[PDB]
Enzyme design. Sequence first.
Site, PDB file in Angstrom:
ATOM      1  N   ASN A  77       8.027  -2.879  11.743  1.00 11.69           N
ATOM      2  CA  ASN A  77       7.231  -2.475  12.542  1.00 11.69           C
ATOM      3  C   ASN A  77       5.343  -3.442  12.711  1.00 11.69           C
ATOM      4  OD1 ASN A  77       7.239  -0.834   9.819  1.00 11.69           O
ATOM      5  ND2 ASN A  77       5.761  -0.206  10.964  1.00 11.69           N
ATOM      6  N   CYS A  97       4.588   4.166   9.344  1.00 13.88           N
ATOM      7  CA  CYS A  97       4.862   4.465   8.557  1.00 13.88           C
ATOM      8  C   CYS A  97       4.327   5.623   7.946  1.00 13.88           C
ATOM      9  CB  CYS A  97       5.746   3.954   6.920  1.00 13.88           C
ATOM     10  SG  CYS A  97       6.876   3.135   7.322  1.00 13.88           S
ATOM     11  N   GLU A 144      10.050   2.068  -0.355  1.00 12.89           N
ATOM     12  CA  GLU A 144       9.025   3.632   0.617  1.00 12.89           C
ATOM     13  C   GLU A 144       9.695   3.595   2.362  1.00 12.89           C
ATOM     14  OE1 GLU A 144       5.261  -0.640  -0.392  1.00 12.89           O
ATOM     15  OE2 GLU A 144       5.972   1.489  -1.166  1.00 12.89           O
TER      16      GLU A 144
END
Lengths: 486, 485
Positions: free
Chosen positions: A150, A282, A248
């Site tokens: 992303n 995110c 993460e």
Amino acid sequence: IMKVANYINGEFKEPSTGAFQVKTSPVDGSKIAEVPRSGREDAREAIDSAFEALKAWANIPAIRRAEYLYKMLEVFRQMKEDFMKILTVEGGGTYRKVWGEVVFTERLIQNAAELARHYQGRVLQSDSESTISVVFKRSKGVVGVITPWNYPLSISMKKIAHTLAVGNTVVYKPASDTPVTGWLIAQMVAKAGLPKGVFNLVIGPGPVVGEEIVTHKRVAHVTFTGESSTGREIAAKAAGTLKTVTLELGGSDPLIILDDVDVDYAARLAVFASLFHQGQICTSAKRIIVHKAVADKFIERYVHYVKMLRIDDPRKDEKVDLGPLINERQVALMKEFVDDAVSRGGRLLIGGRSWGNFFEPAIFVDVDRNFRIMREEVFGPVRPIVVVENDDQAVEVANDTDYGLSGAVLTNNVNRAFRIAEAVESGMFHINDVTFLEESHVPFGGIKASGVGREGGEWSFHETTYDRWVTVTLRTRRFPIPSALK
Amino acid sequence: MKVANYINGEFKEPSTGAFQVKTSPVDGSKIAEVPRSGREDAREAIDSAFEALKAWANIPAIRRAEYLYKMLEVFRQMKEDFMKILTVEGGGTYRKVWGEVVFTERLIQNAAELARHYQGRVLQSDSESTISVVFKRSKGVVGVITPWNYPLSISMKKIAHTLAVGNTVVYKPASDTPVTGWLIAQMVAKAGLPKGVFNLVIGPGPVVGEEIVTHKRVAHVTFTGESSTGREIAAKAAGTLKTVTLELGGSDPLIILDDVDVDYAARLAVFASLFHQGQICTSAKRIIVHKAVADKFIERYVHYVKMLRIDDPRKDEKVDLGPLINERQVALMKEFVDDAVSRGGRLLIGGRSWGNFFEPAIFVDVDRNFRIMREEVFGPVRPIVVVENDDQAVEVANDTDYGLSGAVLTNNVNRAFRIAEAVESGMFHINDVTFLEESHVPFGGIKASGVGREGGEWSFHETTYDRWVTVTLRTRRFPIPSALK
Ligand SMILES: NC(=O)c1ccc[n+]([C@@H]2O[C@H](COP(=O)([O-])OP(=O)(O)OC[C@H]3O[C@@H](n4cnc5c(N)ncnc54)[C@H](OP(=O)(O)O)[C@@H]3O)[C@@H](O)[C@H]2O)c1
Ligand SMILES: NC(=O)c1ccc[n+]([C@@H]2O[C@H](COP(=O)([O-])OP(=O)(O)OC[C@H]3O[C@@H](n4cnc5c(N)ncnc54)[C@H](OP(=O)(O)O)[C@@H]3O)[C@@H](O)[C@H]2O)c1
């Protein structure tokens, strides 16, 4: 004029098998490049190269590693437009998105160079007489870097630049949907002339190349950004050789809007926070939670601005708001989210159409806690708005998620802001700003299902170094055994 | 004697009523009946810790420090009972258990001293009109799983520091030292800590420990034990993304150069290699001596080893070594001796065993293929290796999978520092024992020796997380929709 290839021990080259795959654009399906499809032996070669380079890289003074990073910064500045091009055509990012990513990446590389010389240990007071007691910082060793699609440049470079600054060497495996960004990174590193083996790029499938990185005995640490399920699998396999991890793993961040806000601004902020990069962030504002006293006005204004969003080929011009999703699987998944919400009685306020890899924002109200878009990370532009009666309820809904990356509250009341901030279960929180706020030198990371550890500036250094207690004892001692002495 | 779990403020039996008898390593005599808890007892403790968490984490630190200062007060009154149990249950000599109790008092006090002082950071924002800070927050409920060798000091380092910073605790002591754990719970109970803040569950690692390690409401596990167990724990812990602290033993090198006071080095080496029968993670397990003083060193070392007195540690204050914790440990030491003999090793002294007692076995003529060079020898069998120069000393020192501590004995500043830099360990000591340890220093290893650090603020780092918070004081314009206006 150049083929895409691995970068291993200072050399651009094909995978040992010579296997390749075709990377196409999510915009129009056109061919971008053939790219390596590396396997286990390519990974091993990269790891061995990183391992052989380690001692010389770790033992030079920090100022010399900073110098290499400043060189990288120089080369990156020359390559900005190439990075923007590729982030757009290979990743589907709009001009404003990829511009922001490139600006941030420049700041990250610079930040890592800036901090290299300044990572300090401690001098301690000893409880014993005549002893000097200090703590040094030492690099962990070879670090595997495994990244998503992303924000493939900034996320990769945050990990890579900081890990290198503090004396680790790197084996980097980019996401399969963004290999050209990975190769451009290797181009940058090579032009900056870093010593052979210090940085290595291997392009290939996660379950093969990535798994070799995670299970190899010479890898000391893996820093990983991706799905929570992939992370738990990596963390499990990492235990075999006792390597540490940074993870993460996505979020379902709450954006909380109280009744005392400027409603129109709240709506402008909420639209940006929830739908930028098509919600593929995110720390996207994935669950919008509004106080009932302003809910009607907010919803009306939010939808008003969503109507204005322009969705198009991101190569067309600089003002395009949203590009496509990364692939057809993402579109299929977003359809499932919409379909589940509608069938559960959810009210679709606006949106819902898709074509190729493009997917319009799809906004819902009248949802409950069993909707898939309330229970799962929605990595795309499908967003629930939940109306609540008071702050206690706002917090309850905010915390009713397995995730805990970021979050935000909009209010002008200092008491309500701080109480909500304290009560929301997240690794990061922002009062009166977007959920995806990020700076190069702050601790970025989550709690709960959103993962483990923090990255950014010295927090990255914490993840990829260890403390080393060393003492010097200046007096001779008597010992309790053998008691028969003297 | 009968011993119970301590769950949610109450001493109680396990819910199956299952119990087992714990015997002394010294003479095999009965000591106590102890719970044999199961998954339900652990679940209850975890649930109690979880329900107590909010109130415990959210009171000011000074309040937690007061409870710890109270624990310190109670511990001071229980010292003799701890010493008694450490000797009878664990087999430690008077000197050993006295040391452990003195250190434990310091650990509890250290955790209390530091509670109010764990700071976050105020940052410079790259944005206008933005406040940017980092808070420290408790991880949540923390499992603590401990070994039998220093069961009091190891448990309390973890327990006190973890509590100080606002975590609640579920504690499972080693199966060979459950009375020590019960005494700890007695101390906590008398300090009057709120119910559920601290919980003890006595039961088998593969059942009670497994549940703690796999439970969804546990945020962190701090573990001290064997490397193989640690790897299993880390793997299991991944299923719920809990973090871990792991101290997994060592095979620490003690390096002796040619410029030393040889007699002093021998005395130091005997203490470092054989205190508590070498059952210390930072025992000096591989002794590496420069050829120029080797003969003289070896003679003096064996001379002092000869003088060691092995006996019932209950006898008097001057016993040097007691027994090993159990017969499994004696059998393991015999395996090590058997392997060394079979490979051409020369047994200079020791090897005699009877019951759980073992006389220190010292080998020369060893090479890198001996099990006593390749594995952690958690007991009183020690190799002495001879090296020709500093490069070889370092090569031998690093030729191990472990990396906990290590030491070098020399008066030369250049050789000392160059050796310290080159040895791959998490801790290193110049001119002192390998097992040097203070309450407020980072204690931990690298390589197979584990992950993370414990002691003072380093324990705090392990059981807290950083929480970045911002306040933005200006409104701004956003890039979508671009049509605005
Ligand atoms: N917490 C954060 O800071 C943050 C921010 C950005 C992105 N993300 C997360 O990233 C997710 C999307 O990215 P993604 O689709 O790339 O996630 P992903 O499916 O978990 O994969 C991420 C990386 O891991 C690799 N991989 C897959 N299986 C592996 C394995 N068994 N061993 C080692 N590596 C393996 C992937 O390689 P392949 O591509 O070849 O499969 C890819 O490079 C988002 O949904 C979000 O959850 C989180
Ligand atoms: N690095 C250090 O700081 C350090 C210092 C002290 C001790 N030690 C290490 O500890 C070793 C000896 O201690 P030990 O014999 O007690 O090691 P251990 O067998 O690994 O056991 C340690 C603890 O873990 C528990 N356990 C066993 N299996 C478990 C599981 N599947 N899940 C959760 N917990 C489990 C044990 O309970 P049970 O008793 O019921 O099995 C015990 O409480 C030494 O060899 C040394 O390696 C290391």
